Amino acid sequence: VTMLYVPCTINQVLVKAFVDSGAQNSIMNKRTAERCGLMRLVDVRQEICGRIHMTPVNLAGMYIPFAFYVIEDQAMDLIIGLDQLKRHQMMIDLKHNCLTIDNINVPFLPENDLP
Amino acid sequence: AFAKVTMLYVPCTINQVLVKAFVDSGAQNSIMNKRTAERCGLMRLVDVRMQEICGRIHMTPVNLAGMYIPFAFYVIEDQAMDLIIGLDQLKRHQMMIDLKHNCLTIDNINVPFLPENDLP
């Protein structure tokens, strides 16, 4: 079965985010953080580069404030963990194959559109 | 300051044995550990054709949301989680992980996620 990925834009940079209800924390790898021009927002206070407390993420057409850690040696570009899934009251709808946020649905990417 | 959200667990009964299942949309396969398979009396249903992977259970009734739902999962010996509900079974049964209402929805029946106190 195809794993869950959603398209999102961070500083006009396309990012394919991994949706993981089993993950405690949301994590972005260092390469994507550099490409999005976010390293200046990293609070450095080990693999963990630091934590970004708030940055706008264009997901489902809306600019949603996200918080996530930055790590260097992660295969995934961006992991949307349970922390952010709950804060924004998201819905992983596998009957309709979409991620729902405030009545807007983001269809999960097909297998061909996966990293 | 610190704050950790409660991980997703749902109560279900397998062979009248209460099982606290871990809901993981990032997990490809559903997995039950050997200890839970033994307590539920499921080792006879384990397929021997493949931390040793004991085998795969092709179909067993799981009472979830009041319904006897046919589940398929692997059995592993050295797994901390009693039962992991992976993406395979989440999609197979058209489930919905509703974090606005804090429940797992199947056929418009809701299973509230267990509070932190009831977690394993």
Residue-wise DSSP of B18-59: EEEEEE-TT-SS-EEEHHHHHHTT-GGG-BTT---EEEEEEE
Query: What is the Cα–Cα distance from B97 to A90, expressed in whole angstroms?
Result: 9
Classify strands A91-93 and A98-101 as parallel, antiparallel or unpaired.
Answer: antiparallel
Contact B7 A82 (CB under 8 A): yes
DSSP label at residue B86: -
Q: Which of B28, B84, B97 lies nearest to residue A92, judging by beta carbons?
A: B97
Q: Does A95 touch chain B (CB under 8 A)?
A: yes
How many other CB atoms sit within 10 Å of the CB of residue B70? 12
Handedness of CA A42, A89, B98, A5 (dihedral sign): negative
Residue type for position B66: G
Is residue A20 annotated as a catalytic residue, yes or no? Answer: yes
Structure tokens at A102: 């405030």
CA-closest candidate to residue A70, choices A90, A89, A45, A99 = A45
According to the entry, how was the structure determined? X-ray
Q: Which of A94, A104, A109 should be substituted to probe chain B, the one whose Cβ sees the most B Cβ atoms within 10 Å?
A: A94
Rounded to 5 degrees, what are φ and ψ at B49?
Answer: -90, 25
Q: Is CATH 2.40.70.10 correct for A1-115?
A: yes
Instruction: Report the 3 state secondary structure along chain A.
Output: CCCCEEEEEECCEEEEEEECCCCCCCEEEHHHHHHCCCHHHCECCCCEEEEEEEEEEEECCEEEEEEEEEECCCCCCEEECHHHHHHCCCEEECCCCEEEECCEEEECCCHHHCC
Longest Cα separation, chain A: 41
Q: Is CATH 3.40.30.10 correct for B1-120?
A: no
- The active-site residue out of B24, B78, B88, B107 is B24
Which residues 11-30 in chain A show a CB within 8 A of chain B? 18-24
Q: Give the resolution to one decimal, in Å.
A: 2.3
